[PDB]
From Swiss-Prot, chain B:
Changing Y84S: Strong decrease in cGAMP-binding. The chain holds residues 156 to 334 of 378 of the full protein. Residues 1-179 are annotated as: Cyclic dinucleotide-binding domain (CBD). The modification Phosphoserine is found at S85. There is a cross-link at K80 (Glycyl lysine isopeptide (Lys-Gly) (interchain with G-Cter in ubiquitin)). This is Stimulator of interferon genes protein. Changing N86A: Strong decrease in cGAMP-binding. Changing C50S: Does not affect palmitoylation. It is found in: Endoplasmic reticulum membrane; Cytoplasm, Perinuclear region; Endoplasmic reticulum-Golgi intermediate compartment membrane; Golgi apparatus membrane. Changing S6A: Decrease in cGAMP-binding. Homotetramer; in presence of cyclic nucleotide (c-di-GMP or cGAMP), forms tetramers and higher-order oligomers through side-by-side packing. Interacts (when phosphorylated) with IRF3; following activation and phosphorylation on the pLxIS motif by TBK1, recruits IRF3. Interacts with RIGI, MAVS and SSR2. Interacts with RNF5 and TRIM56. Interacts with TBK1; when homodimer, leading to subsequent production of IFN-beta. Was named MPYS because the protein sequence begins by Met-Pro-Tyr-Ser residues.
Length: 180, 179
């Protein structure tokens, strides 16, 4: 997970965080100032420690609704001309009402950990996977301390699903951060 | 081991099944540029010292960008229409175009390089070479069990000769196209 965390910084957050606010301003110009709130001008990244990462947020929560993409960012990377980095804007509902708008996505390496843990060859225990997911988050959190752009450009949302019958709403969790 | 799985799961598993279709479309738009069977695979560069320049022409001027394949869009981890893109290069020999292929570096190696230069990472130069070797070996293993979508990629693993001459990238790439 140490390698995965450094990879997520070096290969993604390092590249995308410095240009984010510029892309937000452009989005606001094209889309009637939709992301004008201070709570809306951050990349919110979901870290499900259980590592269940769907490709569509509607698979896990009906209240997280795709609206539009930010302008794409093109960067020449490792031989690939104009490799494209993209981010998606979601509206978060609360009892049918549009309660917040944000840029949202999952931390992609957690999807890798899931698939890897369950493979016949390279697999490892669920408990090892949870250890690794936590070690991934902690290592990324450590890395981002030397990165000043981190503080105002992203929000790390780390959580586990309950298995005891207690309520947890992902939409509610995102909204709580937006509203703060 | 972890980086190799990320590279398979998060990339090669996603793009290899769709590659031939993109190659057909590319050929329809660019005069069968990728006509030879040697030109119909993704060639991926694996420098064992983990040096990954972002621009291939800067490290070997006999390798020159021509065009991109059509983009592939996939919904990924909350990103709608995440974009996957590949680049086509011509390779010169004795100063004249002698081959054309889809070429790139294995991006995770650049992470290993960068880690070896940042003290926070606790990651030595020896650590780097070991992990680079392990990364390549692990990936070859993965691709065995995915026999389909072989014919779709070739791995070019290389290092500088121990007490030999500078390794020619363009010549290594032609050797693989022609093999
Ligand atoms: N060569 C190439 N072109 C691609 O489009 C591409 N997409 C992914 N990859 C490489 O595949 C492997 C896994 O990618 P994944 O997405 O899981 O994790 C990626 C992913 O979480 C993230 N990342 C990179 N690009 C994006 C992106 N565009 N959107 C979200 N995450 C990204 O940061 C991790 C490290 O990135 P790279 O170091 O480039 O290497 C990746 C990786 O080793 C690609 N490689």
């Amino acid at each position: 997970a140490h390698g995965l965390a450094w990879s997520y910084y070096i290969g993604y957050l390092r590249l995308i965080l410095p240009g984010l606010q510029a892309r937000i301003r452009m989005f606001n110009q094209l889309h009637n100032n939709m992301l004008s709130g201070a709570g809306s001008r951050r990349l919110y990244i979901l870290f499900p420690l259980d590592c269940g990462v769907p490709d569509n947020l509607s698979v896990v929560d009906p209240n997280i609704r795709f609206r539009d993409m930010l302008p794409q960012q093109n960067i020449d990377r490792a031989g690939i001309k104009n490799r494209v980095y993209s981010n998606s804007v979601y509206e978060i509902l609360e009892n049918g009402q549009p309660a917040g708008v944000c840029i949202l996505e999952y931390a992609t390496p957690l999807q890798t950990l899931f698939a890897m843990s369950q493979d016949a060859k390279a697999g490892f225990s669920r408990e090892d996977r949870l250890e690794q997911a936590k070690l991934f988050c902690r290592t990324l959190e450590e890395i981002l301390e030397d990165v000043p752009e981190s503080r105002n450009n992203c929000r790390l949302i780390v959580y586990q699903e309950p298995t005891d019958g207690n309520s947890f709403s992902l939409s509610q969790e995102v909204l709580r951060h937006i509203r703060q």
